[PDB]
Coordinates of C-alpha atoms in Angstrom, one line a residue:
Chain A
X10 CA 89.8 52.1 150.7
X11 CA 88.1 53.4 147.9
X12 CA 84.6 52.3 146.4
X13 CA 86.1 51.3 143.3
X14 CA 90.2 51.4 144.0
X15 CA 90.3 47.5 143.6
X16 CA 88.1 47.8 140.2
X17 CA 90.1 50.3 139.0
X18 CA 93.7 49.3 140.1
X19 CA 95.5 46.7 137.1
X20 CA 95.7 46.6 133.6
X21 CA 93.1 47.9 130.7
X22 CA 93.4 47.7 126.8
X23 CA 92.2 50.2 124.7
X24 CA 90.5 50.1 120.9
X25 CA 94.1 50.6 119.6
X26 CA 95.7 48.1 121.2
X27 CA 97.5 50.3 124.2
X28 CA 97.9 49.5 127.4
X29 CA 97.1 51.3 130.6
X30 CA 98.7 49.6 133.8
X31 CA 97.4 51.8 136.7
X32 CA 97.0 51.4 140.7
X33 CA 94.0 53.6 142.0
X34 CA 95.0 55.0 146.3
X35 CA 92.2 54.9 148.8
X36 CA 93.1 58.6 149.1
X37 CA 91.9 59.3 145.4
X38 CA 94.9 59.0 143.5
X39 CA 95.7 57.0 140.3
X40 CA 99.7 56.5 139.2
X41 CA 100.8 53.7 137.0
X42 CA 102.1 53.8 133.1
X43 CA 100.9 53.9 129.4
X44 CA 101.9 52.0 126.3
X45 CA 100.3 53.6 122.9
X46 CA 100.1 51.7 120.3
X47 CA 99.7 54.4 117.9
X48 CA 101.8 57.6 117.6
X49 CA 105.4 59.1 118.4
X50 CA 105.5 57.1 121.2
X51 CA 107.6 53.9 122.3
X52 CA 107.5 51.8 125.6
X53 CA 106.1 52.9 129.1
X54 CA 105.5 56.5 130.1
X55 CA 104.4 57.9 133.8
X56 CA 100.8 58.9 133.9
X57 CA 99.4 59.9 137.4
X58 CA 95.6 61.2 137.7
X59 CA 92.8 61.0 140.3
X60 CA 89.2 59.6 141.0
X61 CA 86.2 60.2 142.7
X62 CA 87.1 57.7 145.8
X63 CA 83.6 58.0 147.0
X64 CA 81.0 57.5 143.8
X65 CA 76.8 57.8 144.0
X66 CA 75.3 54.5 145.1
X67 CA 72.4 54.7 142.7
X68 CA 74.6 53.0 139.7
X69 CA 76.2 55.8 138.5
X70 CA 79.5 55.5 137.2
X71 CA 82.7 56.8 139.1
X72 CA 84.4 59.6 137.5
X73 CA 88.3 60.2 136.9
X74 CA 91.2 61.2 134.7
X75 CA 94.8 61.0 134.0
X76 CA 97.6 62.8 132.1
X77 CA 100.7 60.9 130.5
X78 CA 103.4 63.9 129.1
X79 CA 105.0 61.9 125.8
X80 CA 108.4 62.1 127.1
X81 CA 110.7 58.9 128.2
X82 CA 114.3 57.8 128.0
X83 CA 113.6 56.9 124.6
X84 CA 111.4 59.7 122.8
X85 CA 109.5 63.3 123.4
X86 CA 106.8 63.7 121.4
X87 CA 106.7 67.7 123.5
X88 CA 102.7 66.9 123.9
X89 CA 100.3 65.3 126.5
X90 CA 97.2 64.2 126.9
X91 CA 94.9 63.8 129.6
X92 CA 91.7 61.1 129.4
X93 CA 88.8 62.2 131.5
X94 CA 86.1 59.5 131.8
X95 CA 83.9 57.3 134.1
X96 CA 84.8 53.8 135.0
X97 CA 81.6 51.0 135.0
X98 CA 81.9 48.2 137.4
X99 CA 80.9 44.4 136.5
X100 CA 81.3 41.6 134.6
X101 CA 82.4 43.5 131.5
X102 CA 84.1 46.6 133.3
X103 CA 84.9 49.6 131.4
X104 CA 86.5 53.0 131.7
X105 CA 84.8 54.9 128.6
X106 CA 86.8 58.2 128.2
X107 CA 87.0 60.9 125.7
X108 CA 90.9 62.6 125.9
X109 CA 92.5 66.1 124.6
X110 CA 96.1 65.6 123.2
X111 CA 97.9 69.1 123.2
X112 CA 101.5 69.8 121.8
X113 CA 104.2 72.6 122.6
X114 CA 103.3 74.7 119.5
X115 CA 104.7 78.1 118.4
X116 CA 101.9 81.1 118.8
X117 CA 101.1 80.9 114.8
X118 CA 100.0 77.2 115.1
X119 CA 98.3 77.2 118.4
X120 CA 95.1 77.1 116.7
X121 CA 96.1 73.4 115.7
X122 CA 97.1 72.4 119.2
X123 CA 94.6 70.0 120.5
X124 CA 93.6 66.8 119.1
X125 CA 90.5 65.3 120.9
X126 CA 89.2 61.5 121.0
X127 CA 87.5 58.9 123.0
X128 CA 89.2 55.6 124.2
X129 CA 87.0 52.2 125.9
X130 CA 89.4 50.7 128.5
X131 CA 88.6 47.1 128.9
X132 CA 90.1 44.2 131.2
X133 CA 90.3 41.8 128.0
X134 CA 91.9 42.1 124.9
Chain B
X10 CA 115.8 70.4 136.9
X11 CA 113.2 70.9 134.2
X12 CA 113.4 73.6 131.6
X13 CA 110.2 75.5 132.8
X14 CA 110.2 73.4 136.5
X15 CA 111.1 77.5 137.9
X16 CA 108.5 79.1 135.1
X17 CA 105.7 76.6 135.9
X18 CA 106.1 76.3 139.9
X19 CA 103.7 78.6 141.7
X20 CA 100.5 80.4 141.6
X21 CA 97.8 81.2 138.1
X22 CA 94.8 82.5 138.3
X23 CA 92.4 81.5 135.3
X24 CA 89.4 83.8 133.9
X25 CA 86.8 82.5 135.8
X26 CA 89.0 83.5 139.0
X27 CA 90.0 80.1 139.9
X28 CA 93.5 79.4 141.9
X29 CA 96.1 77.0 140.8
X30 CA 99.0 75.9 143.0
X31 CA 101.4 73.6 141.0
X32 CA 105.0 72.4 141.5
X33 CA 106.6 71.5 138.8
X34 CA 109.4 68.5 139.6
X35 CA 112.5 67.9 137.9
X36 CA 110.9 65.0 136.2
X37 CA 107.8 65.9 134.5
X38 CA 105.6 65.8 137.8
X39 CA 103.2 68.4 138.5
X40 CA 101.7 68.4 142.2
X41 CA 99.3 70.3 143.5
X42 CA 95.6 72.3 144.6
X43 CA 92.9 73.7 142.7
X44 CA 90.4 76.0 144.1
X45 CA 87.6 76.7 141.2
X46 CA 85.6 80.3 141.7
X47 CA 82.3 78.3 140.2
X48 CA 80.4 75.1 139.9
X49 CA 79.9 72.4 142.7
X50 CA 83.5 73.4 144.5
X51 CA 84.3 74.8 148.2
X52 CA 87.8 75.2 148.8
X53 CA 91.1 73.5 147.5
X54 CA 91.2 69.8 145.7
X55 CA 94.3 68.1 145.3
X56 CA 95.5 68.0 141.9
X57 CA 98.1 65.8 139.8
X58 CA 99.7 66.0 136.7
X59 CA 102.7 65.6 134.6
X60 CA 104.5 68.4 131.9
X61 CA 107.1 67.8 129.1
X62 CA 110.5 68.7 130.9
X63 CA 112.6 69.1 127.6
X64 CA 110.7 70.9 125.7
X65 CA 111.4 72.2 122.1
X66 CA 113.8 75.2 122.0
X67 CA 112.5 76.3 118.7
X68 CA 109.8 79.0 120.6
X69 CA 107.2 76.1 121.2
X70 CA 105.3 75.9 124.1
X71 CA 105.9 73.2 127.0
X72 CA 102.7 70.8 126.9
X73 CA 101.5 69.9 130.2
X74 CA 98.3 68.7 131.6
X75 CA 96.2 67.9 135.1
X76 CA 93.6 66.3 137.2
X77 CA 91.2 67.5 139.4
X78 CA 88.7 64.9 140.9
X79 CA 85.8 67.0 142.4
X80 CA 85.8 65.1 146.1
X81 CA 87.2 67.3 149.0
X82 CA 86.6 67.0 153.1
X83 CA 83.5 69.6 151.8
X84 CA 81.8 68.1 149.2
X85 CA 81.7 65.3 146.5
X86 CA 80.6 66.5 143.0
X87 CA 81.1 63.1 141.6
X88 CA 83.0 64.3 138.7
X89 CA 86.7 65.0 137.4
X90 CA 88.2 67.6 135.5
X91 CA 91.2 67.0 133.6
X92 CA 93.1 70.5 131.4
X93 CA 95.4 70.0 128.5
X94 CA 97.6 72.7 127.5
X95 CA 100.7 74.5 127.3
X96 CA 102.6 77.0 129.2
X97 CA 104.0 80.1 127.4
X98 CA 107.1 81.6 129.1
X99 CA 108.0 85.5 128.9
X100 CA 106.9 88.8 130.5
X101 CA 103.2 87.7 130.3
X102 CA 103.8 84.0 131.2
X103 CA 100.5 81.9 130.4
X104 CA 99.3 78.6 130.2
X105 CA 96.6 78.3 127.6
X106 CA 94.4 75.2 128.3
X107 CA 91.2 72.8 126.9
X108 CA 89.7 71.1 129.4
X109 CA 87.1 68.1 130.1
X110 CA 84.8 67.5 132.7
X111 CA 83.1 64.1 133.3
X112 CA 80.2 63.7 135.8
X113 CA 79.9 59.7 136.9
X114 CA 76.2 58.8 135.2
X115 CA 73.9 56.1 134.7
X116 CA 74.5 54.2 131.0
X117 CA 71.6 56.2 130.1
X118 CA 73.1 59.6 130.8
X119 CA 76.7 59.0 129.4
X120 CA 75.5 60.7 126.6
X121 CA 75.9 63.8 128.5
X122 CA 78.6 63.3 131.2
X123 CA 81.3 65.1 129.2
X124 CA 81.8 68.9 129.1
X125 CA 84.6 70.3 127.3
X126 CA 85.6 74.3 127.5
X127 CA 88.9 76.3 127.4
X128 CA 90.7 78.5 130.8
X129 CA 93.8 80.4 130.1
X130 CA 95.9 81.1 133.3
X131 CA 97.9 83.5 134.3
X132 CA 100.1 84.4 137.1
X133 CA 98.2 87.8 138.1
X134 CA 94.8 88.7 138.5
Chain C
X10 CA 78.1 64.7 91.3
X11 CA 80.2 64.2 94.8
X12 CA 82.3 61.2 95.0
X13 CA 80.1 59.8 97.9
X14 CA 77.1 61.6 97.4
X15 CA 75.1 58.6 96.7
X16 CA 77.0 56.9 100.2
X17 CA 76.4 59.5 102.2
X18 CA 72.5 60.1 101.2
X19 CA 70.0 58.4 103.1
X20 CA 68.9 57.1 106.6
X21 CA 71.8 56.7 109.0
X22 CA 71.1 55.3 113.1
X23 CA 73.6 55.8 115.7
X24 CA 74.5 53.8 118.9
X25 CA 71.7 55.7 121.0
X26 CA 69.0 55.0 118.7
X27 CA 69.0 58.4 117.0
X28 CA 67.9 58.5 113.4
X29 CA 70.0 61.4 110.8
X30 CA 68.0 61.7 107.4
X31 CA 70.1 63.3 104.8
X32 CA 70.9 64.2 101.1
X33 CA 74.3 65.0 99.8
X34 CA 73.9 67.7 96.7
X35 CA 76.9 67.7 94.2
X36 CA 78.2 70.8 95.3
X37 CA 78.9 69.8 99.0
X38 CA 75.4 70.6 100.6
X39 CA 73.9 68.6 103.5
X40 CA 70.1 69.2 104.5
X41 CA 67.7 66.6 106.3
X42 CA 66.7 66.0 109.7
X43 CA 67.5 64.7 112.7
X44 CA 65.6 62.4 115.3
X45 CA 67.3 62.0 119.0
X46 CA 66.7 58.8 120.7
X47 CA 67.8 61.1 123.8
X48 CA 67.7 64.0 125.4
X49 CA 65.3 67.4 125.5
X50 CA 63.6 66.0 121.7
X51 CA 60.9 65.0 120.2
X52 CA 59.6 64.3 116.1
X53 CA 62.6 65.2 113.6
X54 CA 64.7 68.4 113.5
X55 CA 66.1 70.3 110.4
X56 CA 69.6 70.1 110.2
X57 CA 72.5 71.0 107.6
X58 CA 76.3 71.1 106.5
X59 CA 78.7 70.4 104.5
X60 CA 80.8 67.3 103.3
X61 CA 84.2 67.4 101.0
X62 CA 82.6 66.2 97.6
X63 CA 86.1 65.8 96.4
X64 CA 88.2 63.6 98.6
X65 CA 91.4 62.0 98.6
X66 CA 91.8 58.3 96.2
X67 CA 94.3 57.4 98.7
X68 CA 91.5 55.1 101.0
X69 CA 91.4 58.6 103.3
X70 CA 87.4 58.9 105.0
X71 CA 85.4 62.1 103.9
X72 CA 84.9 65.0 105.7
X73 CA 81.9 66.3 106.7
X74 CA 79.8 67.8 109.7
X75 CA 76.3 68.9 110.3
X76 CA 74.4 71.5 112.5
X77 CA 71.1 70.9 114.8
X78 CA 69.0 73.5 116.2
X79 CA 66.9 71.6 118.9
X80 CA 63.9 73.7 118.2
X81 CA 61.1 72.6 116.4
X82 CA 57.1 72.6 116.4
X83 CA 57.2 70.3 119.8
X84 CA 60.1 72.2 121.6
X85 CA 62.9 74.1 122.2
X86 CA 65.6 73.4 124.3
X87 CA 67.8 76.2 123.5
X88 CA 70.4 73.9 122.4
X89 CA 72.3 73.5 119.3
X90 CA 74.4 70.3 118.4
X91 CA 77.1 70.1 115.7
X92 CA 79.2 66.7 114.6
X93 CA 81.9 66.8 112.6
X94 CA 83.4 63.8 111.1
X95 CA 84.4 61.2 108.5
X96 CA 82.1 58.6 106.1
X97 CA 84.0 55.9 105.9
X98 CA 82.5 54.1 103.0
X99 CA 82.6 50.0 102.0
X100 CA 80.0 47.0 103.2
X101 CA 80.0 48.1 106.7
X102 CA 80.0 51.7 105.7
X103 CA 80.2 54.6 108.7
X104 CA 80.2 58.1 109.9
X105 CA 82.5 58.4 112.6
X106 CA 81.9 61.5 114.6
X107 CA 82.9 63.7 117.7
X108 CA 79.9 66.7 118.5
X109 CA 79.5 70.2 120.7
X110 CA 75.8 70.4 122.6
X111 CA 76.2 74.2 123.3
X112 CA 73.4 75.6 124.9
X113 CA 72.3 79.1 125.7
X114 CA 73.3 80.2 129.1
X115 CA 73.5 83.2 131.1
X116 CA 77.1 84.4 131.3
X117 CA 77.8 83.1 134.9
X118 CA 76.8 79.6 134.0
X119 CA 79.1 79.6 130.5
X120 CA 81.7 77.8 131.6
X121 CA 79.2 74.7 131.8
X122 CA 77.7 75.7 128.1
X123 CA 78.6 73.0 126.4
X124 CA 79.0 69.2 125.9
X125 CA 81.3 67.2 124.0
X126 CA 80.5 63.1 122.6
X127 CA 81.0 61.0 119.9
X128 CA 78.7 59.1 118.1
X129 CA 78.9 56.2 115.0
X130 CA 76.7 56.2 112.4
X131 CA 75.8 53.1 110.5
X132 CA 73.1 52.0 108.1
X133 CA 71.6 49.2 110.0
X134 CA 70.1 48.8 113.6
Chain D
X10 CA 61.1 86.8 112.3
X11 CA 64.0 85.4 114.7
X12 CA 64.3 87.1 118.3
X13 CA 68.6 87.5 116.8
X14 CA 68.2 87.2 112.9
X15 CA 69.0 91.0 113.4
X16 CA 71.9 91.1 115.7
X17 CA 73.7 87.5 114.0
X18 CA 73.0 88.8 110.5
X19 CA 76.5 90.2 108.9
X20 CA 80.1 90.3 109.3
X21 CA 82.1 89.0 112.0
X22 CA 85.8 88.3 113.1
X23 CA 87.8 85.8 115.5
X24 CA 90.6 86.5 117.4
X25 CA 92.7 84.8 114.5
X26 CA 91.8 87.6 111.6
X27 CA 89.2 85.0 110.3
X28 CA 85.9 86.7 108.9
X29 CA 82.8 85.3 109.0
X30 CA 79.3 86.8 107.0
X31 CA 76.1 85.1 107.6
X32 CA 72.5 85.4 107.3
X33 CA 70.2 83.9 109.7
X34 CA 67.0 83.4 108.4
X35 CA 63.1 84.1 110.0
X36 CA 63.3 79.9 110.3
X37 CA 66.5 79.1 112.2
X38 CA 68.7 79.3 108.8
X39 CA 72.3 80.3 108.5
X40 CA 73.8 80.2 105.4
X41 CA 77.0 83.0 104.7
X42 CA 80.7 82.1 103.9
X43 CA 84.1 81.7 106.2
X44 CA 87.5 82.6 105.3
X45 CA 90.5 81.6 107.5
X46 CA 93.5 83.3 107.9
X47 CA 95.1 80.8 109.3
X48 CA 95.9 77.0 107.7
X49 CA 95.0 75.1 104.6
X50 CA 92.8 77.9 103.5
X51 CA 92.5 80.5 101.3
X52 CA 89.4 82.9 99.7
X53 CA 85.9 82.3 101.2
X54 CA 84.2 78.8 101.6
X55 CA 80.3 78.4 102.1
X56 CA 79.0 77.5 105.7
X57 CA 75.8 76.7 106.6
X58 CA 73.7 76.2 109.7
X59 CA 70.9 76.8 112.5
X60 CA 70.4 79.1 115.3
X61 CA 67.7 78.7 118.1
X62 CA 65.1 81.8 116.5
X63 CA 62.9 81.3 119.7
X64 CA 65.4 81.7 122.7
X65 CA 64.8 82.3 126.5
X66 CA 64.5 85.9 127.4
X67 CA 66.0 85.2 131.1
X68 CA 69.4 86.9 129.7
X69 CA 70.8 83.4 128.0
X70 CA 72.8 83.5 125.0
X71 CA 71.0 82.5 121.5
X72 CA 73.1 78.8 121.0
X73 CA 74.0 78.4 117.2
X74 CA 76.2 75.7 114.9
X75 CA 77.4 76.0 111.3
X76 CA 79.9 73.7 109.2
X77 CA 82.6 74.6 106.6
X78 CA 83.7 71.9 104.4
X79 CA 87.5 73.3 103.4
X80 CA 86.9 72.6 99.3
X81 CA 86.5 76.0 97.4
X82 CA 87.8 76.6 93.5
X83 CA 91.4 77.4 94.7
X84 CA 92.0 74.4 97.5
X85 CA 90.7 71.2 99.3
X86 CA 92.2 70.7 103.0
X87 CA 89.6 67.4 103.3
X88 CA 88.2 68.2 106.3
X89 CA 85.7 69.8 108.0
X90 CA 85.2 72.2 110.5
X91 CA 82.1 72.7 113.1
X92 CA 81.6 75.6 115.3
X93 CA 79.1 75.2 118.3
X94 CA 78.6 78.2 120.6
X95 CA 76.3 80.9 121.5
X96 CA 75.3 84.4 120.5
X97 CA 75.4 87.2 123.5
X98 CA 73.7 90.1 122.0
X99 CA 74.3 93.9 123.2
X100 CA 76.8 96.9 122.8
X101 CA 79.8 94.4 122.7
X102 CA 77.7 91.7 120.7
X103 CA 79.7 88.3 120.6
X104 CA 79.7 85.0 119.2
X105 CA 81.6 82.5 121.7
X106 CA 82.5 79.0 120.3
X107 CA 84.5 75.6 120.6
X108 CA 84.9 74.2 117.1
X109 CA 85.6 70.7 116.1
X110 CA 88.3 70.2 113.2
X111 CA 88.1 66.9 111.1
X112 CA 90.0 65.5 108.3
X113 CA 89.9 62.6 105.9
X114 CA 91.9 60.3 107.2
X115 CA 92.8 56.5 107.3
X116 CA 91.8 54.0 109.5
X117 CA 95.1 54.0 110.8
X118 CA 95.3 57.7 111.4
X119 CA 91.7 58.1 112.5
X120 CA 92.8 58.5 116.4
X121 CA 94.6 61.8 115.0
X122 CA 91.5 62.8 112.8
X123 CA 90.2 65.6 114.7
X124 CA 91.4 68.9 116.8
X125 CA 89.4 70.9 119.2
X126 CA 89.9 74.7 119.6
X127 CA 88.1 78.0 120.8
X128 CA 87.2 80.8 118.2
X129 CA 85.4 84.6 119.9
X130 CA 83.7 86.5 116.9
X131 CA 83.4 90.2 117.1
X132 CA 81.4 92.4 115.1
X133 CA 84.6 94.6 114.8
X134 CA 88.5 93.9 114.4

């Protein structure tokens, strides 16, 4: 298994109120769905990413990421965005990210592609 | 299928003279390696992803994005790098990207764990 | 005068202990220093930048962002730093900001130039 | 004076049509103004900012920052934008950035605030 697949793997809440429901493979590999609860977005979509299945020992955290495309049965907001972070172990766990959102844009407005943020994952709330 | 599952599936090469091998599936999925030309990297690492598979038909690009988690059979560079871009279709296919790479730190560190730059791939060179 | 010249001006701490010294001039100027709490620093930095001295009266935060050149008397580590962000103003008033750490590099290591963060700026602590 | 206050000093261009004219100064100054030819933009807008005037003379770029706050006499966009790069001096002199894009925005929209992008000034074009 991985160091950190069973600290990883479940559910995490984010600043805004979306949820993150993810299962983390000893092999590296993270799959599971997103809920934002801001944006052209509505219900689940698929996200799959990876981790770093074998982290320092010295208390550093583990890193990883994951992408979710904005496109379900229900909407397509034609943009994704992919959250690259580190997950912290212990009693308050956390996966403290900072995330590029990119749409499908014509080549005059590719300038104004990317929007970039940060988003604390916790276990609670 | 997807609208760019045939325009997306194969082999890019990005500035830096990196490989990307990517299958796009019908679905949204994108599947497969990355070798990068520099940094703490020997060889291929399995990357994951996912791609709007309806894009816009108005000229727009097709957002998409990756991961790459920086822990093959060769080495472990504690650290994950996840692009955010699009893919532009035509004689000179590209897909323009942002990208973020976090290193796993100690609490003190996470100040620096983050760095963000830009690759644009193509499918020569 | 600015609409939040008199907000913005003054002694500002952020979650790593960093200290940002400034004064907003009518016409959109921002000059003081900076203190890191982090990093390759020591003593206070000059910085500048701007800030919209004529925002929206819809509740909408004020634009600004700033410059740091980490070289001073004590050091120089080659570095510069810009944020760029929003005052958000009221009894807990903020600056909300994302930054770029670029530093100089030699052309094979400028793929790994530059950083990306966020820090929050508040009046107390 | 500074080891580039000679080769940053004047008129530059991005790959957008955008022109840039600064002076850096014996200190670490740059002061000049921007005009975009792209977005909620039009005539020049002041920038100001800091270059490293000591840099390392191992072949390393010169690393530089300056803001633009989007209010002139003709428009306010309420936002701000930071570039962070580095200067590479020589027959093909360039100035190689990532830039951070904020707006005003509310609390609600704050997630959105801010895009991230990639601007290379040239001395012609």
């Amino acid at each position: 298994m991985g160091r950190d697949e069973a600290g990883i793997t479940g559910t995490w809440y984010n600043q805004l109120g979306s949820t993150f429901i993810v299962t983390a493979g000893a092999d590296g590999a993270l799959t599971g769905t997103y809920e934002s609860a801001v944006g052209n977005a509505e219900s689940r979509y698929v996200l799959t990413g990876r981790y770093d299945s074998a982290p320092a020992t010295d208390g550093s955290g583990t890193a990883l990421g994951w992408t979710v495309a904005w496109k379900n049965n229900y909407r397509n907001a034609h943009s994704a965005t992919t959250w690259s972070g580190q997950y912290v172990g212990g009693a308050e766990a956390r996966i403290n990210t900072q995330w590029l959102l990119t749409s499908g844009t014509t080549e005059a407005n590719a300038w104004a592609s990317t929007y970039v943020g940060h988003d604390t994952f916790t276990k609670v709330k």
